[PDB]
Amino acid sequence: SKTDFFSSFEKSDLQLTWTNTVETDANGKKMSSGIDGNVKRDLILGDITDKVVQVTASANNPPNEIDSKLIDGDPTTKWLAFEPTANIVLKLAEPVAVVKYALTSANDAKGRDPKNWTLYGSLDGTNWTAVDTREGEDFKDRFQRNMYDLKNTTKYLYYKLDITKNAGDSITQLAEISLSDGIEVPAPPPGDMKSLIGKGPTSSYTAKTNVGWTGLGALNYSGTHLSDGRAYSYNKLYDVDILVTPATELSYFIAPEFTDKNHNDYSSTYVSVDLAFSDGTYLHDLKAVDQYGVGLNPKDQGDSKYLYVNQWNTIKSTIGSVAAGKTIKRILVAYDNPKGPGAFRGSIDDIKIDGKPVQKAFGSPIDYVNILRGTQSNGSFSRGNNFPAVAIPHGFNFWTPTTNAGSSWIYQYHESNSVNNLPQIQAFSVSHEPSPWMGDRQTFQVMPSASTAATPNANRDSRALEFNHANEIAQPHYYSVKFENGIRTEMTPTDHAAMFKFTFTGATSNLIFDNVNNNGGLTIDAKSGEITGYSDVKSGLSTGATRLFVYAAFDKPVIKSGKLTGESRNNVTGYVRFDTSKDEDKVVTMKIATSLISVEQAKKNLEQEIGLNDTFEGLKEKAKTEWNKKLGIIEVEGASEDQLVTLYSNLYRLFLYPNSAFENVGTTTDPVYKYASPYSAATGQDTATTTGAKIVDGKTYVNNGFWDTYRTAWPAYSLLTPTFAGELIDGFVQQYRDGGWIARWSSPGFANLMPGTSSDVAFADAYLKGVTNFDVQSFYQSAIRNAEAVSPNAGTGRKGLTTSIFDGYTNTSTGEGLAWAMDGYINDFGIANLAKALKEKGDKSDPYYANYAADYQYFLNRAQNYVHMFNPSIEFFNGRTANGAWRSTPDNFNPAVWGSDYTETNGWNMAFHVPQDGQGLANLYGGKEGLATKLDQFFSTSETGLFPGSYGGTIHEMREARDVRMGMYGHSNQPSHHIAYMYDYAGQPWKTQEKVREALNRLYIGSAIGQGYSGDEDNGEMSAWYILSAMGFYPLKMGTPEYAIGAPLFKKATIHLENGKSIVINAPNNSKENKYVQSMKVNGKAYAKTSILHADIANGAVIDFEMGSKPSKWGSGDQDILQSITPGSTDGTSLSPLPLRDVTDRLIAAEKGAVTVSDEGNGQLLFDNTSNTQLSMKSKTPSIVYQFKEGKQNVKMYTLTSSKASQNEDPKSWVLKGSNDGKSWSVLDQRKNETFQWRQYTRAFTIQHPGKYSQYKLEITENAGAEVTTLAELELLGYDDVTNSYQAVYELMEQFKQSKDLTGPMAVQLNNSLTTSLDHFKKDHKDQAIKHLEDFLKHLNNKGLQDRISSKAKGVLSADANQLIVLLARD
Ligand SMILES: OC[C@@H]1[C@@H](O)[C@H](O)[C@H](O)c2nccn21
Ligand SMILES: OC[C@@H]1[C@@H](O)[C@H](O)[C@H](O)c2nccn21
Ligand SMILES: [Ca+2]
Ligand SMILES: [Ca+2]
Ligand SMILES: [Ca+2]
Ligand SMILES: [Ca+2]
Ligand SMILES: [Ca+2]
């Protein structure tokens, strides 16, 4: 007998042996329980409709208004045909004598209702006996059901409703048909689970509905799970005789569907293909496993959560492993689910059994790369939302097929398939799209055509050419498609150019040129066989995008040529025609290059990169080589095929962005680099052949949202490609030197989207890791501009800075102000560490040098300002209104609700937004244990996607987050990406290990069918998450050169570093299940810590993980956790310490402070916490005095914010003085010859001789030249009196004495030591105050006294004492 079997459930395939039929056991008992297959419906007397197994109408209106809709029991779904007449054929399971039927009219357009019809009956389906005629029928209402009786005792297997006249329209429609046999059943029995050949998915996020995976047919299953507990049904499909061999693979495609309004019932995933063997055993009893390791049985399919609902899923199982030598007697479909009630529905297509499968071979990393990942994905549900980008790493152009030539939605894997269910290309495009949301720009289009008409038609629909994915090769360096009609197109990239081979079958062959829309030009010089063009195409968010120029040449004479018309694209549509009658002329080659400078430059770009000697194959090899140099930085052992696809495709995505936007205007020997600026104003107007944009010397790179890429991609560069990273960074620093700012979202200029200015942290982070090959000085300037200087541009700097730099938080007056705020504090963390590093560098030629020290202090403080956005009443980060009040209170708050404060997520997902200081974050939650409790709750509460909040309706990010099914964890999007690693701060690293492994395992699947990710990939970010996590470490603390340890994915990984050394990562015992770190070594030596320095791996290292299947305590020690700014000893403090703040804040209004100016101006404008108010003081030489009415203030720093007015009015030299009486002043700080290069720009100064004073005076000794002196704001940055903290501890100690948590000599000794400490503090004896607090701690740990304190009390009092020491040390 045979070893192979295949069904696509087509017309041409074998029909099912049984339909809707349950398999029976050895005893003849149905293998089903608690199931109802019947569709829910309004039943008529003797309703028989459930025996209809097939309905076929003469014409249809796919995707939604097809014959299928006639028996689905929903009046809301209809069949429609664009015809005045038609016939519907109903095939029944068994012959029945129909004696009654009902038609139901549809939703609208009464004229389309049937009016005259005949019902026929048949035995064979070709010879028809009339059984009822109706004429002149009327349906008064929409959704109206008419009932019809007839005499008939003849059992028939087919019924035809022949609709001979409708109600006058040229279109016909009907919502529902029901048939009846006239026999009463007062109690309709449950029917068997449905299993029948149908049209495929009735709903799908990402695929074409009502077609198969391939072809027009599939197997459809559905039913109702009635039971509270287990329900199942194993149904037989096909009678076969198939011998299984050791190598036999079973594969299939399954598309489970949601049957509920809420898209929360996952029942449809509890399904698999099953086999009945001749020996009386079933595949579901053997330990067959899929490509993910999941049992190939229904229960394990559903429990393991690898099947996505409303999407197609590829499944593959080597049943040979477990069933070699058995014979398959029947193929089954099985549903089996432990819990309900619920309901399910889905499709299976392409059940294949292959006795001798051929495995794919791979010669090098690039052979693993599928550039189609992220294309069975759209705006309803993303599996990456990429496009098939062919390019060199970081190339100047992308090249790509498009199935939608008007759109930034460039290529659909399945969604836009033809009536024959094949994809259609409409063009090959030059592209610069960073994402579909940002949109495409600078595009240009060609399409081959075998048209013989006088003129090739340039209409998108009519020129489109169908193809099969099996005939398409899609790689970074090579794309190839063979179309159904015999044409082949192949392309390969250069940096600025590309080569295409068009191979034809006919005598007359054409290339059609076109564009996304009419905003460009085409010039065809037929005589020299050249194309010339320009493109102004640019999406809404393509801010600063300039004109692109195109040049192209052919290897064959062009015989006919010209402009085309009729598409409303007359500026861009034309063609060239070639004589390809002779065999050696059947392939035509086009060489094509692009420029943002000029047509002349496009020409020069082409000559530089495609010499006369270059061939298609030579260029392809050059591109393959450039990709392998990137892909082969990482080499792993033990990986499956699926893992290597994911790994190497991830590395491709990582290096696809960002992109060169500069050109070589000199020669290959002597390069001269220049770019057209999307950053500053155009020099002048464009011409057809030359750009008007400013031509700027040097390099630049583009296409990057820092809100995405800072998390993973940028640190990936700094680790994997240190040297190139610096060239990339400098190309972004260029944006500062040119346009004044570094882009927040470069697309290619300053596009306005997403919160934060994370170039700050990304580039700071890179520098501190030893990527020093860029203009750090300018970078720094751009960072402080982001951090200190209000932006006039919508697309640059930090929104809400007007108030936020003074308030310590960003208020709800800025959209998603919380989001701006939290990312602000992380950026400040990086700016601060860089300032420290530049201080230590000591470059005295840096004009800014004297200022680094101060900036470190000020910025490290700002990094801790997260406290100002932590709402203590709900224990979540939360917005504040302008007046200071929390947005939410316990009564109204819901952490499940998306939006408002929370960009593209909910409060849950922003609960942990403090990667720069985990201990500080833990403290807000009560300590490490409190942090862990919060995370646990996060990971065990399911995201339902039902809470859109401010988004109004469902956005795709919500569906994706829902389908992660890791509690609330939104791995589908960037703002959650740090969360799994936060367990390293809580001292539970095993939970990080668990979550990271689930993420790597389940959320990067489906590559083979154009899926591959759990949501939008975003310019390398989702990819680098996987690459870094799989190595076993992760840059959690962006802005400081070290990683948090997770666990490696592979038995071995090597990172070949550019300096010739290796990072080897050994985990010989690694496996799907062995996910937990048991112990760890670095360089032969046992390693205890869950952090590792970049400086320890960058010069090579050997890392050994002992992996096992059970959690361990490795890395849970108090000094083994990730360290923070906040000391570990403070864990669990009852105090709420603050970093530097402006101690004048809010005093004036509460009358606890006031201000006087030497000229009697309103000095309140200098302390109102807004740079939108300034004071002009009528003197070159004014004085401001701030008076604290409630005692001495410990001020460490102060800030001056330049005004909006001219720079000449600025302070320039000054003295800050302190006093206690107002008569006698001490000199605290002196500055000379200061400047404020920007407007509304804050500068911070470290007071040379600080102390505690009740009165502060700023005495301006010199200004910048004008007759007046103007400022916007002043601040006195200091700390609260430590005394108030001591007080809070006495208070707490009293609470414990009253509860008897603290008694006897322990109470007394603690009291004494604290009091002696306090007394020393008040006499300015800092060292002695600390020493007595150390005594306090010794008491707490006195062995003789443990029966006098509870653990609760000992714990918090310890933490408090240590917190006090910290408060003291900084005082
Ligand atoms: O083109 C027919 C379409 C229908 O498919 C749709 O259901 C609706 O009834 C309608 N109103 C006007 C036109 N149409
Ligand atoms: O594509 C640009 C931005 C991204 O940078 C970001 O990841 C965000 O999730 C998003 N959703 C739609 C568009 N975008
Ligand atoms: Ca099929
Ligand atoms: Ca219907
Ligand atoms: Ca995103
Ligand atoms: Ca203030
Ligand atoms: Ca002000």
Residue numbers in the entry: 41 to 1411
Publication text:
In contrast to B. thetaiota­omicron, which produces GH92 α-mannosidases as solely catalytic domains, NnGH92 has five domains.
Here, the biochemical investigation and crystal structure of the full-length five-domain GH92 α-1,2-mannosidase from Neobacillus novalis (NnGH92) with manno­imidazole bound in the active site and an additional mannoimidazole bound to the N-terminal CBM32 are reported. There are two independent monomers in the asymmetric unit. A CBM32 (residues 86–222) is inserted into a loop of the CBM-like domain. The rest of the description will focus on the better ordered chain A. The catalytic domain was traced without any breaks and its fold, as expected, was very similar to that of Bt3990, with an r.m.s.d. of 2.01 Å over 712 equivalent Cα atoms reflecting the moderate sequence identity (41.6%). The reaction mechanism of GH92 enzymes, with catalysis occurring with inversion of the anomeric configuration, requires two residues: an acid to assist the departure of the leaving group and a base to enhance the nucleophilic attack of water.
